[PDB]
Structure formats: structure tokens, C-alpha cells
Swiss-Prot record, chain A:
Oligomer and partners: Probably a homodimer, forms a PezA(2)PezT(2) heterotetramer. The heterotetramer is much more stable than either of the proteins alone, and a specific mechanism may be necessary to liberate the toxin.
Portion of the parent chain present: 67 to 158 of 158
Induction (record text): Conflicting data is available; found to be a member of the pezAT operon (upon ectopic expression in E.coli); in S.pneumoniae strain 0100993 is found in a monocistronic operon.
Single annotated GO MF: toxic substance binding
GO biological process, one term: negative regulation of cell killing
Species: Streptococcus pneumoniae serotype 4 (strain ATCC BAA-334 / TIGR4)
UniProt protein name: Antitoxin PezA
Described function: Antitoxin component of a type II toxin-antitoxin (TA) system. Upon expression in E.coli neutralizes the toxic effect of cognate toxin PezT. Represses transcription of its own operon, PezT acts as a corepressor, considerably increasing repression.
Top-rank taxon, per record: Bacteria
Lineage of origin: Bacteria, Bacillati, Bacillota, Bacilli, Lactobacillales
Keywords per UniProt: DNA-binding, Repressor, Toxin-antitoxin system, Transcription, Transcription regulation
UniProtKB/Swiss-Prot annotation, chain D:
Effect of T117V: Abolishes lethality
Protein name per UniProt: Toxin PezT
Induction description: Conflicting data is available; found to be a member of the pezAT operon (upon ectopic expression in E.coli); in S.pneumoniae strain 0100993 is found in an operon with the 2 following genes (SP_1052 and SP_1053).
Lineage: Bacteria, Bacillati, Bacillota, Bacilli, Lactobacillales
Gene that this sequence comes from: pezT
Subunit structure, as described in the record: Forms a PezA(2)PezT(2) heterotetramer. The heterotetramer is much more stable than either of the proteins alone, and a specific mechanism may be necessary to liberate the toxin.
Effects seen without this gene: Strains with a pezT/SP_1052/SP_1053 disruption have partially attenuated virulence, they take longer to develop a terminal infection in mice, although they grow normally in liquid culture. A double SP_1052/SP_1053 disruption grows almost as well as wild-type, showing the effect is mostly due to disruption of pezT.
Pfam family, one: Zeta_toxin
Organism: Streptococcus pneumoniae serotype 4 (strain ATCC BAA-334 / TIGR4)
Family: Belongs to the zeta toxin family.
Outcome reported for the amino acid change (mutating D66T): Abolishes lethality
Role of this protein: Toxic component of a type II toxin-antitoxin (TA) system. Phosphorylates UDP-N-acetyl-D-glucosamine (UNAG) on the 3'-hydroxyl group of the N-acetyl-D-glucosamine moiety, yielding UNAG-3P. UNAG-3P inhibits MurA, the first committed step in cell wall synthesis, which is then blocked. Upon expression in E.coli results in decreased cell growth and viability, followed 3 hours later by growth restoration; the toxic effect and phosphorylation of UNAG are neutralized by coexpression with cognate antitoxin PezA.
Length: 92, 244, 93, 247
């Protein structure tokens, strides 16, 4: 890692944080529209919001490689895919 | 319209307190760090430094992220294409207020994205933070104003890729002025300036020179080898976003 | 795009990644079974995960053509795995 | 009441949710194709999975026999009772799931990519001749690579699978070279498959029966016994290096 790589990482970290925060806010939107209590840790939606929350608020900043980012990205990808299918069954 | 009932604030607030508390532990010796610096300078760098420096144990409170949490965000986006901000910061700010208050009572480590273009907001914040028994520090991020203005434009060409339906840069003079004044009024135990490559370029603990002065040479100094390098990379990536 | 040596490397990684997913799925099935969630209860959130995951294992993974898409995938699997860990422990609580 | 003796309801419950999974994302026709796999275990069967899933644009169903062993209704108890040997108690369920899924899916009209048992002449004979009988174009997709390079990938994979789960050789698989050549020639002589394709690890196609007029088996032997390319010669160097890593 050099100064440019390191910053380009900081930029990917940023991109991911924003993208994540966007999805978390959508998760909260979905969770409320279902009456799912916040600490209902048994609910799979609560787990996703909780995991993601732990990353945006802590773990992304602790990332040291471009690979870790691609992993977190495809993880968000996974979330979004499930979130999109649930809102379309909803406004169906 | 854009109103929010009081059970909605307590709802999203209670949620956020559950959210941010996660995996963090309280302190008899807690630390609060305020963030200054041009918008597109990459404050996200300081997050990386201070998260690793506290080994996961610091709560970051970024006012901007709390915007989508307005109980009628969708409605306000499906009209105010970009001017939804003044209807959201009413909500977002008080969200920060309540979060800083409660967590500062519970003695967590706090990292707060600061409105350093204004003198008062941070001053009045660290004051109510020091009473609670906080070592309160300032953490500034600095690069050449240009590269800063550049990343904001890079960002805005990526904020248009996501949703077509979705700055604070021209501040260099306010930023220097407000730093000298916060330094003289001795509000912060420790003042630190960081550069994009996570280097600590000034630390008020070690150094004796004015934090404001170090800023000016950093802004108005001749360009470093690496800075000119970053300037081309931007001209590179903007052009792709010129056609992506 | 890619060297024959690199291309087989990708094949091996796709094979690696598939096998993991397959085992996560089996694991995810076993949990859904203990929870009496019916095979086709698409309404149930857990079924979305098993739908999503099996769709990639059976189809999407074989259409991967970059190494970074491999990471994309295994980072997904990580998430699925983290939630299984927590759910399984919650049964023993 | 054995530790591996599954209830019928238990077996059907699995068959149910598999038939659902494997169908999800696929349309069927009155013009369906079934492709049987051949080639040593370490050859790189996953290469064809790639070629054909792309070639069919997501509309083929890959049936992987071992995918279902972990679906055994006691799999875990068998895992912490026999370690790696759970296999010898688990194929009973796993095989029955494959025979099942082909039966039902062939009738339903879906495109199928199935493993063949080219180590035995009888199995694929019977399989193809029963798939033909349901309006299927049956095929043989062979993956051929230098036997050594096959044993080597099996030996790397083995040491890898030991690292993931320390409680989950190539003699344990098979040395099919003569059998896989003989039987290919035998299934050609009996002219059972409509097409026979032979692929390599770089997704290249080195033989197609509908475009080429040599023997599938004749092409096999050149690949098995011919001179080594640098691409072959190199994979051997990577294998020695990668193996040293794993040990």
C-alpha cells in the first residue's frame, strides 16, 4: 500500500458506508411496515440490520485490503436482492 | 407535509442507541473527538485512524446518515429532488443532540462529524462534553483545496449513477479562522491534523506551533509529489464518469 | 480476458465457492426444519435466503468470469454464515 | 433402528424441497437436452458446469450427487461418528436422491446436466436409453486432461477439504483411464448419444462428434497419452508449489 492506494481504499470504504447506510434505512423502512419489534433478534430482518449496522458503524473502517471490500459489497448485494423482493410482494 | 410525531423520534432514537452501543464498552476515562475540514477532503480517513486507534471501541455519529430516517423521507424525495435537506436537518440535528447527550452520560468514546465552518456549534458541544468528564479533542483533515473540490465532483458523478432522484467546500478561510479561535479559547485538550495517507502532520500534544498556521502551509503550500499525482487520478476517473 | 492457468484457477475458486454454499444451504435447511418453516413458505424471510442462496449455487455461480466476483460471492456466504451461527445459538439459550 | 436409516417422510421432504430449488429459474420444453458427464474425478468437471450453464443461458439443471449427502436426516450424527467414513453410510441416501431427481425432472421436461458413471458401461447405457424414451437428446460431455494433472488436483483438493473440516486420496476415487477410454469407444460403437463433446480445462472444445469424424475415444487417447503442452507442463509446476503450501 502507498498513499494513493491507501486513499483509494478510503474512497471504497466511503462508497460502501454510504451504500450500506442507504440499505439500513430501507431495512428500517421495511421492518416498521411489518411491525417487527427492534430487538426481535429472532427475526431474520433484525439480524441483517444488526450485522450491517455493526459493519457501517465499525468494521468497514477496520478494513485493510481491496478484497475485503469486494466481500462486503457482494454481501450488500445479497441484502438488496432480498430487500427488493420483499417490497414488490408488498406494493403488489 | 414533513412533520414527525414524538413517538417516531423516540422510536428511531431508541433504535439508534441500540444500534451504536453494539460491541462498544463504557469508560471512566472517555474521549470525544470533533471533526473539521473541507467536505471532500476525505474525513472518512480519520474514521479509519480513530477506529483502529480505539480498536473498534469508538462510536461515530455522522449527522448526514440520519437523514433517510425521517418518517416521511420517501415522500420528501418524491418531490424535493435535492432540496429535501432543510426539511431533514431539523430532524437529523436533534437526532445528534439526543445521541451525544445520552451516550456522553453513559461514557462511551465519541467521534463527531463537526460543522467547522461555524465557530459556535463545536464550542458549545465540547463545553457540554467536558462537564461530563470527557477528554475532548479536535481532529482536522487537510489537503489542497483543489483535490478536495475534485473528490466532491467525483462523488456527485457517483451519486447520479445510483438514483437520478437524490456542498461544504468553499470554507478554507472560515476553517483557518475558526481553528485559531478555538485554539486560543483553549476548548480542546488535544488538536490533531491528518493527511489523506493517514499521516499525522500536527499533534498539539507534541507540537507547539499554532494548529491554524500548520493548516495554511498545508493549503497554500507548494504541491507535494503525491498531491499532483492525485490530481491526475481525478482527471482520470471523472472522465470515465463523464461517460458512465 | 484471462490466461488458461488463471481460467482454471477461477474454475477451482468457483468449485470451492459452490461447495461452501451447498454446505451452508444444507445447514440452513436443517435450521428451517427445526423451526417448522414449510418448504415453500416464500412469505417466511428464511425461505428468501435459501431461495437466494440456492439460485446462485445451481445457476449464477457458473456464470462468474472475474476473480472479484468470487469475493463478492464469498462475502455474501459470510453474512449468511454469521446469521446461522447466531440463530443456532439462540436455540440453545 | 440404524443411525443412517431414514424415514420415507424424511426422504420425501428432501426430494420435495430439492425439486423446488432445482426447478426455480428454469423453463422446460418438448425439445429437452440431457448431457452426461465423463472423465476422472480430478480432471475438472466444474469446467463443463461453466461451459454448459453459459451455453444454455441459465436454463440447464446441474445435478450434483454429493450435494445431497449433507441432506441426510442424520448427517451430523454420522459426521461425528465416522468422520470421513460417513460417506460409506451416506451414499445410500445421496444416490436415491439423484435417481429420484432425474426420474421426475426428465418427465417434467427440464434440461439436465448429470454425472455419468463411465467407470461402468451399464449405468450410462441404462440412463441414456431411458432419457431417450422421454424425447430427450442425450449427450456425452467428456472432460479430458493429463492423468497426472488429474491425480494432482485430487491431491490438492483432498488436503484442502481436510483444512475446512478436519472431520469431513485418489485411490479412494478411481484410476479410470483404460475404462474411460474403452467405455467411450463402446458407447460410440453402440451410437447412443446424439452428440459427444470433449472439453479441456481452459473451456476449449477439442472434439465435437457432430462436427468431427474421429473417435471420441481416439481423441481421448491423444490427450491422455500425447506429448505435454507448456500449459500442461506449467500446471504441474503450480501443483507442486500449491501442494507444498497446503502441507
Amino acid at each position: 500500500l502507498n498513499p494513493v492506494e491507501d486513499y483509494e481504499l478510503t474512497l471504497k470504504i466511503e462508497i460502501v458506508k454510504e451504500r450500506g447506510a442507504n440499505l439500513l434505512s430501507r431495512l428500517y423502512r421495511y421492518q416498521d411496515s411489518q411491525g417487527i419489534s427492534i430487538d426481535d433478534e429472532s427475526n431474520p430482518w433484525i439480524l441483517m440490520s444488526d450485522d450491517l449496522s455493526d459493519l457501517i458503524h465499525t468494521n468497514i473502517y477496520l478494513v485493510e485490503t481491496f478484497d475485503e471490500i469486494e466481500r462486503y459489497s457482494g454481501y450488500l448485494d445479497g441484502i438488496e436482492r432480498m430487500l427488493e423482493i420483499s417490497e414488490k410482494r408488498m406494493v403488489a | 407535509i414533513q412533520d414527525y410525531t414524538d413517538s417516531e423520534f423516540k422510536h428511531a432514537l431508541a433504535r439508534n442507541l441500540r444500534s451504536l452501543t453494539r460491541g462498544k464498552k463504557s469508560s471512566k476515562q472517555p474521549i470525544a473527538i470533533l471533526l473539521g475540514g473541507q467536505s471532500g477532503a476525505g474525513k472518512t480517513t480519520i474514521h479509519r485512524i480513530k477506529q483502529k486507534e480505539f480498536q473498534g471501541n469508538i462510536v461515530i455519529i455522522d449527522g448526514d446518515s440520519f437523514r433517510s430516517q425521517h418518517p416521511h423521507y420517501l415522500e420528501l424525495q418524491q418531490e424535493y429532488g435535492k432540496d429535501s435537506v432543510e426539511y431533514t436537518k431539523d430532524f437529523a440535528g436533534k437526532m445528534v443532540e439526543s445521541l451525544v447527550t445520552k451516550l456522553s452520560s453513559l461514557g462511551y468514546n465519541l467521534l463527531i462529524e463537526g460543522t467547522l465552518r461555524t465557530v459556535d456549534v463545536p464550542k458549545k458541544t465540547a463545553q457540554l462534553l467536558k462537564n461530563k468528564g470527557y477528554e475532548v479533542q479536535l481532529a482536522l483533515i487537510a489537503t489542497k483545496p483543489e483535490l478536495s473540490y475534485l473528490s466532491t465532483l467525483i462523488r456527485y458523478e457517483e451519486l447520479y449513477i445510483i438514483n437520478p432522484n437524490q456542498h461544504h467546500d468553499f470554507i478554507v478561510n472560515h476553517l483557518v479562522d475558526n481553528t485559531r479561535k478555538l485554539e486560543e479559547l483553549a476548548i480542546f485538550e488535544r488538536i490533531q491534523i491528518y493527511q489523506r495517507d493517514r499521516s499525522c502532520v500536527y499533534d498539539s500534544k507534541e507540537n507547539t506551533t499554532s494548529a491554524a498556521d500548520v493548516l495554511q502551509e498545508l493549503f497554500f503550500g507548494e504541491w507535494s509529489q503525491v498531491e499532483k499525482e492525485m490530481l491526475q487520478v481525478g482527471e482520470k476517473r471523472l472522465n470515465e464518469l463523464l461517460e458512465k
